[PDB]
Amino acid sequence: EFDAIKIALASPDMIRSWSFGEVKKPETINYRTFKPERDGLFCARIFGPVKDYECLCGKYKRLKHRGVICEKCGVEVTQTKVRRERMGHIELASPTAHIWFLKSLPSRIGLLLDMPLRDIERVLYFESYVVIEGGMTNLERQQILTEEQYLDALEEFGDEFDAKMGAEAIQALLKSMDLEQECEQLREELNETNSETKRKKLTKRIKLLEAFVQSGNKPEWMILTVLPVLPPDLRPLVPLDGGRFATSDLNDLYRRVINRNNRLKRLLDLAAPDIIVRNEKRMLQEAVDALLDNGRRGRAITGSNKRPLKSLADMIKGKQGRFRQNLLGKRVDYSGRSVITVGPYLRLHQCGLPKKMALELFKPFIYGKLELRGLATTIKAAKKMVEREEAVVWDILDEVIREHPVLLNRAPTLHRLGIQAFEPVLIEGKAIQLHPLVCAAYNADFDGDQMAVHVPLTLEAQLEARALMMSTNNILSPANGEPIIVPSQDVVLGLYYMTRDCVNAKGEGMVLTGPKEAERLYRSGLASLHARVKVRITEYEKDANGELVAKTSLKDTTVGRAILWMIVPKGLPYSIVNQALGKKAISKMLNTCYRILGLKPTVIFADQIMYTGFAYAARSGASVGIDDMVIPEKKHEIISEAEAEVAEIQEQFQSGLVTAGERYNKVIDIWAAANDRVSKAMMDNLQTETVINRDGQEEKQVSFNSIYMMADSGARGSAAQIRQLAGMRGLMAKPDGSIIETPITANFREGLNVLQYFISTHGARKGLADTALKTANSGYLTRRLVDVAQDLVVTEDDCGTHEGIMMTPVIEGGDVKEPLRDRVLGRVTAEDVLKPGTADILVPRNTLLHEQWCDLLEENSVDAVKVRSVVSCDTDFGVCAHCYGRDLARGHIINKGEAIGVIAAQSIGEPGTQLTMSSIQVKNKGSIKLSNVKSVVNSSGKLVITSRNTELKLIDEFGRTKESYKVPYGAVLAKGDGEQVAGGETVANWDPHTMPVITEVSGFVRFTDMIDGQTITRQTDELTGLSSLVVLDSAERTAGGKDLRPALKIVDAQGNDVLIPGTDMPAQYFLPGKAIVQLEDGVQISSGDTLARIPQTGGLPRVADLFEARRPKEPAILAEISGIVSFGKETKGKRRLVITPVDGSDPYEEMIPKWRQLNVFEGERVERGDVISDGPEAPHDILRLRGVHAVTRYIVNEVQDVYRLQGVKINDKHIEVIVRQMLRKATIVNAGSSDFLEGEQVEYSRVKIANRELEANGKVGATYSRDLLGITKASLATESFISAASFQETTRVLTEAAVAGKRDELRGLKENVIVGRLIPAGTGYAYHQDRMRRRAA
Amino acid sequence: HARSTGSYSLVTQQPLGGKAQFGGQRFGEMEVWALEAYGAAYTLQEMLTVKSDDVNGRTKMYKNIVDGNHQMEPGMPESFNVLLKEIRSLGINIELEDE
Amino acid sequence: ARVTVQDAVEKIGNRFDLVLVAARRARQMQVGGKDPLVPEENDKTTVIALREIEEGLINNQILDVRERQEQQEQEAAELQAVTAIAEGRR
DNA sequence: GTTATCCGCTCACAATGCCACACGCGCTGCTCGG
DNA sequence: CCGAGCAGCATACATTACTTGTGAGCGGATAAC
Ligand SMILES: [Mg+2]
Ligand SMILES: [Zn+2]
Ligand SMILES: [Zn+2]
């Protein structure tokens, strides 16, 4: 019916057009006769008839009169439904402002009039005056007046001077203003003046005026004159059991406003006492403002119920506003919920369903089937039959769902798997059985967690659920290519018990003709479930692609493993079972089965695993008793010894032999050491206490204790929890975060004193409060996420670009925290990555890096590869297939249509519930690389470092990078480049609080204004007696040395300045403040000598601030361009600092906070993008300096560190698309032949296609700077508005998109969701491409 | 408890909420994001319009599914028309574009 | 017997187009029901369509050409009938 | 002095989802009334 | 003479109430020509 949405202001004529009449009386319904009072807020004459197809007075009562209006009461007898549609209007007795365009920063009227908002508010509410048209008097058209000035000018001028006050004054002021005239005036003016703050405000204003005159809007419409009142049915006076009709607050506000209007009109008729009508118009303005928004201007509280009233805006914004309450997520009538039990018998795609719930849900299908078999001719007969549940209705129901899928959902649906599709199976009771594996996928325990059901009723939806969201399709998380179907517990225990080996168990030493023989031998009670035997086994293989050879071997194994072998489906070799088969082993087996055999045998194999695991777990009878957890017989001794240690340490302290802080440190250290001792002793006594004997003396073996069998198998709980249970509970943490001296020497099996329990409670409550807050915080985070990437749909199949990122294995300095294999697994190469031997292309330029190519790369051991990321794809309004790469949760490349944005947001936000809230020591061998290093050789054969971007790297034998540290300015080098060193050797150490003035050219040194008393303070080293000088800068001392500047001239051995080796610029070594110089005047300098020495979150909020990209506290300032450093005038607001370019000009003398430490010298030639005052690098500056690849690398590395700190893994594609989103905005630099302004903020896509179209012609394009907004502000500044409307603001975006007439083309997920049509993402992508290829020609 | 059909909210033609009111479950924001994460376009569409709103559309779906035909005739959810009328009740003019 | 859709998505290298064409064929076999080619096992029309897909005898082109053949037969028959009526009215 | 510059001041504007249950929902002295 | 509806009332006042975290417009101090 449409393909777009237009929004703008409403002219009074338009509003009066909408209405079917004018409400005049405030009272709504007479109570002695429940009828809409005539010409009231519910009047039938104005809105519609109450009874369906019946006159109000009762005259006409039949469909024979559809259309006529009565004459006793005058109502148009039609369908009552129309009362849901018809609107009313109120002819306001005097103009009044519109509270939105007055108090929505920036106020539309304010910018439209160049008048400060305070004066506008003071003139709207009748407490000022405004002269208009600027008559013969010296009064400007925008000037305001108070009382005395107004009356004095009135005495001085009786005419030609029109000082009106109030709303209608502003209306006249607007309607008198010429739009395009002032527009072109400011246009011609903007190219005239300075600075850029005035130019910024003025370009904002001319943008407003141009958007205004462009759209059909007219400024006088911004002041309401006829207020449209909502249809009655949408504000229904809901009744109670008697006549206590609950007055919806909208009717209250409307009654207040219409009452003010009626009273004001009556006053206007009775000779109008001037001040009285003044105050009355003020009151009416106030009431209308309250109706449009109860927020500003105080409140409008209902009677005796101290709470504000829901205004109109209050019915749109917020969690109860129509957007987040009824439009985006609407309640469904065709579903149900219950509590979930286990039901561990059903197959992987099935799911339990209570007879009651199915009989209630599928009721229409049952009616249809009954009508088919004719068992009930009428529908009411079928309803009766279902009501009685005849013995045939159950057969019918069982028939009607034989393949009909169903949807199961968990309450917090963090990620995509929160809703899955199953086939229902009828059961008894009221619980909802579901497979245990998927309940590990839902993050669903059985603590009473409820689940909702849904029935897809149309054929498309049935087949869609069967094809897409059926459990046998989702077996890999869209976040990581790991398998989501992981046998969690109670089966890993079962299989682990089934695969072990008692050294002497009944049946050991036999030979079995096959697995079935072992199974029979076991069930008959002749051989233990796990005893070493010799079993013949026929493991199949695939020698050639497709074949299945058989190699009947005779392997030494155990009965349990042989029994389990009856489940592997003619694929995997025997080595996948022969091991102890813990939990990680089970995940590995399932993974390799999905890798070799495909999918269907893998799901059958997983179900068989689950069945046999539960079976033999039950048959095992694993049971934890009190005597299972053992205490090592040294724990008492170890604790007593550590007690003696801490006692003598404390005595030493009170004996005055150690400071209290270091004493605390020693105490906590010996306590942690004793804790580790007890833990190791407990482990070594528990895991091997089983010392059994076979045909003789004794043998050890891994324990058979129930505990540590639930642990070694990884079934439940780690060794850290075991030692916290049997062994010592260890140290505990104070509420602040500090650690108590005395730890919990006890353990759970033994008793716990009151104090120990108290401290444990400290810790536990800390954890619980953290969870209770992080849940809500992560919810808000993921909600913000999904509303900034909800547009991304993979449309193009190949953007055809060449720019990617240089993916390289991360190295935090220690080991490689992440190799290149996983960071590049499944992502198409941007460039044809060739092996280190050049001229031989290893991989073509558009290869999907599936696993075998990653194997090849590992073989040739490539350092880094360029890859086609998403942040560089060239798709208009989307992203191409290749630039997204491997479709995680599947194997192939992505299919055109998958809404990568939403799944990325979900994958990022799901683990949010698991977040929180001097020397160099090489390790391996290999060459020693030093990148971007300007250093000088001292008088000791070393290499002292003289630059800031010197990066040390340890390279292994394969030429690939292994370690990387950041050697700062002023470090010593025990070795040079190409020096094979062994680990641990301290190749570099430095005093952190020394920023030396080491020289790169030796000789002598002379002084330029290095004088004591005034500039410098001389003091003796009272320890020894050397005449040290504390050289103060201009800032350090008083003003007596502002102009006086030190300069250590690097002079020849006679006292004259020589140049620098390589160039002709000598070293004028200036000084920073607090310079403790030792080398007296004229003393020889050796190249590289210290001429002076001067000293110097973490969880969900971290990633939050990172995605918002908000400027951190005192960010690390960088250099805009290159050149030589030079200070300026102190206290220029901030101290001056310029960087002279190599050849260009330096028009900027940037201001820097003088107080905060400045890391740069004055004789340094600082390349752009270098640390000036260390700290966090704000992402804005990062982008604006080093392009987009720098900022995307930085953000992905930071967030990925944050996640890897918690053990969760997230593939970088998702954060990549997110950063691609939060920098889709752009700013314009020049103007060019394009119709774009200078400072106008435009979308990178639109400006890029405009440049493309202009380059199609001969004209020039406009240069652009990629912007970068926080996810929230980026989403708010979206091309479409309805998305941005519903997301977070829906009171500014509406005003703006209205006053500009931003016709919203839907072309997006959330928009189409709101409208209710299909989505451009799913099969709806096929639908929409068919449409835009046919409907739009 | 489950809900096939029944009453509906009068201000917004949606099914009521609550076991007592015989209402049905609420398909929430995160539920919609999940549903559209999969390519479940048609499922999300029918769960939006014809299940909960488009009173004519849902009566048509009922009458058409008792007749053994699982095809939907969707439309405009009356909640959206309610939003239209609320905005239009403000000074803002919002329309459905002709084409 | 449908537990997976991998064979289907192999015959149509996209799950989206897969479910689209399969829903089209199922609508064919459910209203104005064309007889299901593969012998059904007393199953719903959905899995019947999926089976006919994965067996390798239903796809986009086959459905379109069958629709066109139906159009041709229908138009030929009705035009013969209308010409007969045209002679009957003279 | 002025013109542009900047820094603290005050205000707007967001706070996970569901489920369930419970409770309540003007009034009041002036006004219409016999 | 009090019972039954009504019209516009922060009950008239001092109601009131610590940090929430962040952005953004704004007004008084500030560097420069
Ligand atoms: Mg739970
Ligand atoms: Zn009448
Ligand atoms: Zn691309």
UniProtKB/Swiss-Prot annotation, chain B:
Q: What does the record note on quaternary structure?
A: The RNAP catalytic core consists of 2 alpha, 1 beta, 1 beta' and 1 omega subunit. When a sigma factor is associated with the core the holoenzyme is formed, which can initiate transcription.
- Residues shown, of full length: 1244 to 1342 of 1342
Provide the family line: Belongs to the RNA polymerase beta chain family.
Q: What does this protein do?
A: DNA-dependent RNA polymerase catalyzes the transcription of DNA into RNA using the four ribonucleoside triphosphates as substrates.
Q: What is this protein called?
A: DNA-directed RNA polymerase subunit beta
Swiss-Prot record, chain C:
Q: Name one GO biological process term.
A: DNA-templated transcription initiation
> What is catalyzed by this enzyme?
RNA(n) + a ribonucleoside 5'-triphosphate = RNA(n+1) + diphosphate
| Pfam families (alphabetical) | RNA_pol_Rpb6
GO molecular function terms here? Answer: bacterial-type RNA polymerase core enzyme binding; DNA binding; DNA-directed RNA polymerase activity
Which EC numbers does the record give? 2.7.7.6
Query: Cellular component per GO?
Result: cytosol; cytosolic DNA-directed RNA polymerase complex; RNA polymerase complex; transcription elongation factor complex
* EC class of the enzyme, as a word: transferase
Instruction: State the UniProt keywords alphabetically.
Output: DNA-directed RNA polymerase, Nucleotidyltransferase, Transcription, Transferase
The record's listing under SMART domains reads: RNA_pol_Rpb6
Q: Which family does it belong to?
A: Belongs to the RNA polymerase subunit omega family.
What is this protein for, i.e. what is its function? Promotes RNA polymerase (RNAP) assembly. Latches the N- and C-terminal regions of the beta' subunit thereby facilitating its interaction with the beta and alpha subunits. Part of the processive rRNA transcription and antitermination complex (rrnTAC). The complex forms an RNA-chaperone ring around the RNA exit tunnel of RNAP. It supports rapid transcription and antitermination of rRNA operons, cotranscriptional rRNA folding, and annealing of distal rRNA regions to allow correct ribosome biogenesis.
Its assembly, as annotated, is: The RNAP catalytic core consists of 2 alpha, 1 beta, 1 beta' and 1 omega subunit. When a sigma factor is associated with the core the holoenzyme is formed, which can initiate transcription. The rRNA transcription and antitermination complex (rrnTAC) consists of RNAP, NusA, NusB, NusE (rpsJ), NusG, SubB, ribosomal protein S4, DNA and precursor rRNA; S4 is more flexible than other subunits.
Q: Report the protein name in the record.
A: DNA-directed RNA polymerase subunit omega
Q: Which gene encodes it?
A: rpoZ
